[PDB]
Amino acid sequence: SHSVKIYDTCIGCTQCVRACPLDVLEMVPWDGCKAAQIASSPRTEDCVGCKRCETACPTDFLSIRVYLGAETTRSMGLAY
Amino acid sequence: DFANLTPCSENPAYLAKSKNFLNTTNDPNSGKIRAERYASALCGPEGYPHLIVDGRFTHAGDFLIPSILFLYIAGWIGWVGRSYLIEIRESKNPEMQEVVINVPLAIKKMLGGFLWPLAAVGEYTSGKLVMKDSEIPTSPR
Amino acid sequence: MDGLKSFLSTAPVMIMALLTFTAGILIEFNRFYPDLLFH
Amino acid sequence: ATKFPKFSQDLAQDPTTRRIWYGIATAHDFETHDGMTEENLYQKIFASHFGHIAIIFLWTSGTLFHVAWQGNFEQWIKDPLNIRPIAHAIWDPHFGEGAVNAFTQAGASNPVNIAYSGVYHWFYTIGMTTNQELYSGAVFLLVLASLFLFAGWLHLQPKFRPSLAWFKNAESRLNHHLAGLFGVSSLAWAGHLVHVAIPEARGQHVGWDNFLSTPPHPAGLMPFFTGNWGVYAADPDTAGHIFGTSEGAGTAILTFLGGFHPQTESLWLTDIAHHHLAIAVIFIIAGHMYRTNWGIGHSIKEILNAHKGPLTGAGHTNLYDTINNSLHFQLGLALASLGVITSLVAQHMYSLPSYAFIAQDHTTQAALYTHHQYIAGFLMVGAFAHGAIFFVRDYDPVANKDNVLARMLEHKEALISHLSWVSLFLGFHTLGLYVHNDVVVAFGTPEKQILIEPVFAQWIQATSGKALYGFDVLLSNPDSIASTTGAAWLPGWLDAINSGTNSLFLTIGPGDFLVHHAIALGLHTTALILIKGALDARGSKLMPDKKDFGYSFPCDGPGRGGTCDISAWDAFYLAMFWMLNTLGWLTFYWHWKHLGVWSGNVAQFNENSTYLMGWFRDYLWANSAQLINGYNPYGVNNLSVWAWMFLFGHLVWATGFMFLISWRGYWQELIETIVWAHERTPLANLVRWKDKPVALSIVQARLVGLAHFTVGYVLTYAAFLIASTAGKFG
Amino acid sequence: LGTADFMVHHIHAFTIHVTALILLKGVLYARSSRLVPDKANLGFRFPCDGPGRGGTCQVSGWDHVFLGLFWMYNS
Amino acid sequence: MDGSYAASYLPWILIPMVGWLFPAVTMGLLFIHIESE
Amino acid sequence: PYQAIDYATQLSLFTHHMWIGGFLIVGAGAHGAIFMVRDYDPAKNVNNLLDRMLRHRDAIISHLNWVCIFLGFHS
Amino acid sequence: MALSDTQILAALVVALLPAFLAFRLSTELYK
Amino acid sequence: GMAHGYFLIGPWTLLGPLRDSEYQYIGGLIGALALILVATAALSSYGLVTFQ
Amino acid sequence: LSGQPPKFGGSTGGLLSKANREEKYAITWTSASEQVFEMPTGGAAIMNEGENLLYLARKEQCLALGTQLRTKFKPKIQDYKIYRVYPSGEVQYLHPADGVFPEKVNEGREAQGTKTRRIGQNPEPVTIKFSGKAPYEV
Ligand code: CLA
Ligand code: CLA
Ligand code: CLA
Ligand code: CLA
Ligand code: CLA
Ligand SMILES: CC1=C(/C=C/C(C)=C\C=C\C(C)=C\C=C\C=C(C)\C=C\C=C(C)/C=C/C2=C(C)C(=O)CCC2(C)C)C(C)(C)CCC1
Numbered sequence A: 001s002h003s004v005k006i007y008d009t010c011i012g013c014t015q016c017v018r019a020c021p022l023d024v025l026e027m028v029p030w031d032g033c034k035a036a037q038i039a040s041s042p043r044t045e046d047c048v049g050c051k052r053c054e055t056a057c058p059t060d061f062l063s064i065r066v067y068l069g070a071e072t073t074r075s076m077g078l079a080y
Numbered sequence B: 001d002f003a004n005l006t007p008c009s010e011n012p013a014y015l016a017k018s019k020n021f022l023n024t025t026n027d028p029n030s031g032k033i034r035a036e037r038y039a040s041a042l043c044g045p046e047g048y049p050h051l052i053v054d055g056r057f058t059h060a061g062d063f064l065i066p067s068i069l070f071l072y073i074a075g076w077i078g079w080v081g082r083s084y085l086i087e088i089r090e091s092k093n094p095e096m097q098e099v100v101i102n103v104p105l106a107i108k109k110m111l112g113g114f115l116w117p118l119a120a121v122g123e124y125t126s127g128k129l130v131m132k133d134s135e136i137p138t139s140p141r
Numbered sequence C: 001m002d003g004l005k006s007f008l009s010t011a012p013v014m015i016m017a018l019l020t021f022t023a024g025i026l027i028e029f030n031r032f033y034p035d036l037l038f039h
Numbered sequence D: 001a002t003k004f005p006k007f008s009q010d011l012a013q014d015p016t017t018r019r020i021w022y023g024i025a026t027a028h029d030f031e032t033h034d035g036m037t038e039e040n041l042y043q044k045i046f047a048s049h050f051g052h053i054a055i056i057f058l059w060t061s062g063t064l065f066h067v068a069w070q071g072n073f074e075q076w077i078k079d080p081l082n083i084r085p086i087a088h089a090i091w092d093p094h095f096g097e098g099a100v101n102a103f104t105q106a107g108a109s110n111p112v113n114i115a116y117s118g119v120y121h122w123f124y125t126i127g128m129t130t131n132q133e134l135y136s137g138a139v140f141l142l143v144l145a146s147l148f149l150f151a152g153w154l155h156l157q158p159k160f161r162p163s164l165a166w167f168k169n170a171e172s173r174l175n176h177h178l179a180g181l182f183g184v185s186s187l188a189w190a191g192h193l194v195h196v197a198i199p200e201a202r203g204q205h206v207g208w209d210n211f212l213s214t215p216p217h218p219a220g221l222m223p224f225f226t227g228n229w230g231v232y233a234a235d236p237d238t239a240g241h242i243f244g245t246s247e248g249a250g251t252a253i254l255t256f257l258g259g260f261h262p263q264t265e266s267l268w269l270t271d272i273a274h275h276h277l278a279i280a281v282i283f284i285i286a287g288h289m290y291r292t293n294w295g296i297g298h299s300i301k302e303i304l305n306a307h308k309g310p311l312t313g314a315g316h317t318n319l320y321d322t323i324n325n326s327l328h329f330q331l332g333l334a335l336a337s338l339g340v341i342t343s344l345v346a347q348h349m350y351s352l353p354s355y356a357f358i359a360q361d362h363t364t365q366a367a368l369y370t371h372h373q374y375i376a377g378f379l380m381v382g383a384f385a386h387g388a389i390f391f392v393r394d395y396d397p398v399a400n401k402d403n404v405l406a407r408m409l410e411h412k413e414a415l416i417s418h419l420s421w422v423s424l425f426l427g428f429h430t431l432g433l434y435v436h437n438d439v440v441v442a443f444g445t446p447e448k449q450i451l452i453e454p455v456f457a458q459w460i461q462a463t464s465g466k467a468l469y470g471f472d473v474l475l476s477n478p479d480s481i482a483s484t485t486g487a488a489w490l491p492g493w494l495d496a497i498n499s500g501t502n503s504l505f506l507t508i509g510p511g512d513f514l515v516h517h518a519i520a521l522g523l524h525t526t527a528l529i530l531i532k533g534a535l536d537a538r539g540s541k542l543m544p545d546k547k548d549f550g551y552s553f554p555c556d557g558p559g560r561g562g563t564c565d566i567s568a569w570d571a572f573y574l575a576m577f578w579m580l581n582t583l584g585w586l587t588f589y590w591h592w593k594h595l596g597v598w599s600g601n602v603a604q605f606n607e608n609s610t611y612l613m614g615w616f617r618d619y620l621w622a623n624s625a626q627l628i629n630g631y632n633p634y635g636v637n638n639l640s641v642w643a644w645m646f647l648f649g650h651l652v653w654a655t656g657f658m659f660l661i662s663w664r665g666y667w668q669e670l671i672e673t674i675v676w677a678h679e680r681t682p683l684a685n686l687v688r689w690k691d692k693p694v695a696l697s698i699v700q701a702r703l704v705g706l707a708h709f710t711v712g713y714v715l716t717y718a719a720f721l722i723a724s725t726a727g728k729f730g
Numbered sequence E: 001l002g003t004a005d006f007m008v009h010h011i012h013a014f015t016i017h018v019t020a021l022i023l024l025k026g027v028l029y030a031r032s033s034r035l036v037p038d039k040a041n042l043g044f045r046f047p048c049d050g051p052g053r054g055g056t057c058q059v060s061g062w063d064h065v066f067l068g069l070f071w072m073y074n075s
Numbered sequence F: 001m002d003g004s005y006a007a008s009y010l011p012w013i014l015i016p017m018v019g020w021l022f023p024a025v026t027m028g029l030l031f032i033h034i035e036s037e
Numbered sequence G: 001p002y003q004a005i006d007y008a009t010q011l012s013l014f015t016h017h018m019w020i021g022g023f024l025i026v027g028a029g030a031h032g033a034i035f036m037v038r039d040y041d042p043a044k045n046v047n048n049l050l051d052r053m054l055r056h057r058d059a060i061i062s063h064l065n066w067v068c069i070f071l072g073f074h075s
Numbered sequence H: 001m002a003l004s005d006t007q008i009l010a011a012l013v014v015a016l017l018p019a020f021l022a023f024r025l026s027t028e029l030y031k
Numbered sequence I: 001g002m003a004h005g006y007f008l009i010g011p012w013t014l015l016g017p018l019r020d021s022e023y024q025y026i027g028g029l030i031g032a033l034a035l036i037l038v039a040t041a042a043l044s045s046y047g048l049v050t051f052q
Numbered sequence J: 001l002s003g004q005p006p007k008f009g010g011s012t013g014g015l016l017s018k019a020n021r022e023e024k025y026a027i028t029w030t031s032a033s034e035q036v037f038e039m040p041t042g043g044a045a046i047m048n049e050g051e052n053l054l055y056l057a058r059k060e061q062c063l064a065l066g067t068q069l070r071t072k073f074k075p076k077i078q079d080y081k082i083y084r085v086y087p088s089g090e091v092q093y094l095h096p097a098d099g100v101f102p103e104k105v106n107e108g109r110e111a112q113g114t115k116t117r118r119i120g121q122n123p124e125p126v127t128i129k130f131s132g133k134a135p136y137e138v
């Protein structure tokens, strides 16, 4: 299972969740930005690691980070 | 001293081959002019001119005159490309001036590049040639 | 006509203008003064 | 679920075939095993050292055993210039009657392989003359491998497991390796040379049965203990001495003669014995420098902390706490120092051979130079690769604050861009002058070539004594203070440097100038990938958190413009091609220059190496002729295995292009059709895989394609190097 | 036509079939695959879908044309 | 395949043992080891 | 006339028209895949030849994968 | 001159001593 | 096994290295006998792995 | 999980042996009209009027359909439920987890993966060499 970490530089423009193809990410309430929301990763067991969230992140450097960890059936994306 | 080399006027392998030099251009005596010009060089065992680049002024035309002629022109190309790039970055749209050349600004810079060594010395003294290293975008180490 | 001048002032056209002029210098120097290995 | 691999819980529950592949490649990365402590890291490393040492001893024993058993060593020493040395016997049931008759060579009664490692010249020079001595050496090295295999098991036992402070004792290890492993072993080797090798060179059999009875010198050890050391140099071997006999032999055990023995065309064994004894005294003195347990000596931390100036800030502060804590710094220092000296072994054994009649065995000196340069090419790249592993893992910016390591990171943009400058400055011109020389030779005007005499390196040949170039400087000038000092090397050195029948200081021309600049382009650009691999290992502007991802990771995704080959492992991977390309350039230069030197046609190299077509035609096309006719429709010869290996290495090198050009998710989607095909095929779907078939990972086939590239590079050239040299001289 | 003409024609039959294999798989799996099921939204000419699922390097239909050009050169 | 060296019967049996019997045992034992629970 | 004895012309005309034809075949696999990404509408493609080609891609490719391995081993 | 049959066979019996000690080291390093 | 063993001597009988000696059928048998021995070892190692 | 399957002629891209051994994935949505949708396993199928039940091999294939069901139709299907189906009969309901689509912020959702520091404020690997933990873990 990979690790998806969300850092405090989040602006809450929800682009990582919309770029997510595996329903890993969701928006939770937060107080550290103007949009008052931070990305969260409650479902990293379904994380394939394809880093579409990191492409969609507009902040510098990144507010979301995917670290490729142990490979399972779900993370290797196998239909077999 | 180059005892392993010989002058091409006294090199016997050059002398048997300079009489068969091919004409490179439309002049029918191009190879004979090349036979006279290459005779003053230093030739090896098979009569080809071996250039000497160590710094001797006897062989200054081998490397030093090509060095002075290159570094003047290459310093000219580098300076007028640098001076154009500084001039266009103060405009409203500095990006379009590189893909669409401001040609009268380019000719004005290029003709002024004949005094690039006195200009590069002056910009080095003024500090505008070299930027401070703490004022530069830097990698996160 | 003004936009044709901008097309002639594009980076592809002007580098083809410069390299033709540069090759124009070097060919015409090596045609009247060929075979210069040294000075 | 699976117990393989036992050192990684992240890999143990991998359901795919990636578990098997990554279990192999993470096996020796002991730092990242689960539950690994610091002291058990060093203890597993220490026993792995003992296992590796005994594999070296078993490899030398197998070399010694097969020469004694299936070789012609006693037949070879009676005519070393004519008899081909036999490596071992061929036993291949695939051989037809053509290949049996082709490989029944070197006076043997069976198909054999000709030795090109040079061990015959090595064994004959160090006194071995019988197959019984080589057999006794092989059995002893079996016993010596047993004493090191048992010691690794013993030092893994909890009674004899060494503590972490013992592994951190740098002063005790440096004192014992210099005075002992470097010093006593060089003193013992000088002891072997004066007792065994020098008398066996002079026709006197000295063995274990009689070395206590006869002395190496008639004067004994009394001139050693009384300070009259010149007795051991009196009466040397003259120029008419024949190796292995007493005719023309002297009595001196330690001479200082300089150049070469005349018949063997190698160094005098008395010079070799005197060299080893002299460096043994210096190494034993050097192994008394550091403070271990008696107060006197140096503290390495104290030297590094004191060595600081105004231009480097903190200087070498806390480098002792950096090197002694980082195994990758120690490994990268060790691989670089071995990488320098293995190149130095290559550049000195061809120019100063030491083994008898090895300067006439041309295929051996070809194979010896190329092997040591290719090993040194590996050791240099892995030194910088482990320099990058140190920066990813073991580097602390807090403890190394403002020292010489952090200031390399601080100006790393100036380091990489100037290495980028030197590579471009060299490569625009070295390629620029070759392509000029190719075109003007093609256009019928080879006198229009830009040919530069390498005056600066010809001058150094003059300052060592070569008066061929007419420079009167230092040793070429007989009237200088360096020439007139009365050095005893000088009559022997000046004779060897001016004979021209050796490879000591070869005459260099414009072809030699141009290919050293390709070599300089090759060394700088390979370094440029490697320093940039080392200093962008922690991070860069495209990937600041690269140290979080580790050393060897695939990428950072296609976002931020794309991040292919962004890891520091990938700059190891890119520099491997450049190292092979550099080693391709220098070994082509070594082989073609020596092919003209050995054949006498030095004008073949000197007038065709200035342009790349002469490299292509007179070297690659011309010398491959007897290679590719190793087999043909009209039969075979002894170059049939090299012809097959030449085409084998072409196949392995081209197969690596598949893993480097075609990439993963093409093949993963291809396997998914193959997986579907197996699942829906009756009588075959009853057979099911336990590990799911997946494509090789992104890092993996970059390694696998590189391994095919490197194995394909080496087996191609070693076939071409040997068959062109043994087809011409062997 | 002899034995050498038999062998080289089957080489030609082999290398055309691989060039047919790479290009037809690039047409059929242009929209989707078991690896990346939404390649139609990613486009015709995209690099990948990241290092995930083991690595989805060169999954696009452009990259089969990229690999088919080598095999056309080889054929 | 012949041999004038002593113990020429030893490459008669060691070549098909190192060639066949050593990999079929080792890769046999490795296949059980790397695929066991 | 006199083409067949000019061995240069016979070798060059075969080779140039081989290479032109091979390049255009690879472009068929290109614009086949560009159609599938861009212009393939599944609403008007139900149970026709193109929909059914997409419905047995693993049948087509894996047999094409097999015949490439067969031909590569047997040529 | 040449080695004997009993010399080659003795070397193989001696070679069982590194064969057994490498087996002990390999199983110790695996632990 | 009877089906697979029966045709397996065929390739080495007619195309093997012993096909032009007096031991053509012997060398075809030993080729297929040693193939079945690897084949039953491939079965039994599979069954130890797959069903454990 | 009730629902008639969509009218599909069959494909080779669908369920392999993983579906009846490890897990499979079911997507359930309600359609207003009988419409044509592109199957994520290759081919085109027809939505039934009312509830549809489609079993897919991967969670990505269900979400590639759910992305298509939400943006490639003139009435948007924004009620699709995605399940994980096990061979033992137990069904784990996956998407959307709280009944609200995850791009919209919902209360009662707890933050996972948040670290309350920057990505450049991660600790060095030298400080954690033999703890076994990554710089993003501890
Ligand atoms: C006129 C602008 C200019 C100048 C003054 C610089 C200056 C620098 N370059 Mg260069 N460079 C430029 C153009 C320029 N470059 C462009 C266009 C590119 C893309 C090809 C690069 C790519 C580049 C590389 C890859 C490298 C350098 C490096 C360097 C340094 C070494 C000098 C050198 O010859 O490098 C060699 C430069 C080249 C081979 C490229 C030159 C390209 C042309 C010939 C320059 C002029 C083109 C421009 C259109 C002129 C505009 C005219 C104006 C009137 C419109 C120096 C700091 C090196 C470095 O960092 O070392 C410290 C290095 O590694 N540069
Ligand atoms: C005098 C005492 C002594 C000696 C003889 C050594 C010797 C050894 N120790 Mg040790 N050590 C000592 C005490 C000693 N130790 C002390 C007290 C410490 C504790 C602080 C250690 C702690 C220590 C550790 C932690 C380890 C070693 C290791 C080693 C081995 C080095 C690897 C090897 O094969 O070397 C071979 C080296 C040589 C033959 C000489 C150097 C060769 C260089 C590269 C150049 C020679 C060039 C020359 C031309 C070559 C000729 C070749 C010929 C074919 C032509 C070696 C057997 C390592 C090992 O492998 O453990 C088993 C290991 O990691 N030692
Ligand atoms: C023959 C093949 C070859 C060539 C010439 C290049 C060229 C170069 N390599 Mg290398 N490279 C190669 C193979 C090659 N490489 C392969 C097989 C690998 C393994 C993947 C790499 C790996 C690699 C890396 C990893 C690095 C290099 C670097 C570079 C530069 C080295 C400096 C130099 O010599 O520049 C001078 C020479 C050239 C640029 C050669 C080209 C000269 C051309 C012919 C003339 C200019 C043409 C002009 C632009 C107009 C073209 C017109 C045309 C469009 C019609 C340069 C771009 C380094 C780099 O870029 O840093 C500086 C770098 O870091 N290369
Ligand atoms: C590591 C050194 C080494 C190498 C590479 C060779 C290579 C060879 N041996 Mg061997 N041999 C060696 C050691 C070596 N031997 C030792 C020291 C002995 C003396 C006991 C023997 C005894 C021997 C016999 C009697 C025979 C061979 C034969 C041969 C050939 C075929 C292989 C075979 O049947 O092996 C059989 C070998 C053995 C049964 C014993 C060898 C035991 C060694 C020490 C194991 C080495 C393991 C190694 C160091 C670990 C690294 C592995 C790594 C790559 C993963 C081949 C030329 C045959 C031959 O001559 O064919 C014509 C043959 O009949 N060898
Ligand atoms: C000479 C180099 C080479 C070789 C050997 C391969 C091999 C392969 N390519 Mg190819 N390929 C290459 C370069 C090469 N490629 C490069 C340069 C590229 C990058 C653009 C690609 C990209 C690529 C693609 C994109 C495709 C292939 C495919 C394939 C396969 C062709 C079908 C097949 O199985 O044939 C049979 C196998 C061979 C002809 C290989 C030689 C086998 C020998 C004769 C067997 C010898 C017996 C064996 C070694 C005994 C074992 C001994 C034991 C000790 C191990 C095969 C695995 C295609 C594929 O997999 O489709 C099925 C595919 O689609 N290739
Ligand atoms: C009482 C005593 C002293 C007297 C000692 C006397 C009276 C004799 C000493 C003899 C000795 C200590 C001999 C040492 C021999 C060591 C050897 C032989 C080691 C060899 C190691 C290797 C690794 C070689 C491998 C190889 C072999 C096997 C080959 O066959 C060729 C290939 C090669 C690789 C070279 C002294 C005065 C000191 C001081 C006070 C103590």
Ligand code: SF4
Residues within 6 Å of the ligand: A004, A016, A019, A020, A021, A022, A023, A024, A025, A046, A047, A048, A049, A050, A051, A052, A053, A054, A066, E052
């Ligand atoms: S890597 Fe892909 S699946 Fe994982 S969180 Fe990022 S976008 Fe979602």
Ligand code: SF4
Residues within 6 Å of the ligand: A006, A009, A010, A011, A012, A013, A014, A015, A016, A017, A038, A039, A056, A057, A058, A059, A063, A064
């Ligand atoms: S990580 Fe990026 S995409 Fe996700 S909420 Fe923060 S800023 Fe938006």
Ligand code: SF4
Residues within 6 Å of the ligand: D554, D555, D556, D557, D558, D562, D563, D564, D565, D663, D698, E047, E048, E049, E050, E051, E055, E056, E057, E058
């Ligand atoms: S390695 Fe492949 S998947 Fe990863 S970023 Fe590069 S192209 Fe994309």
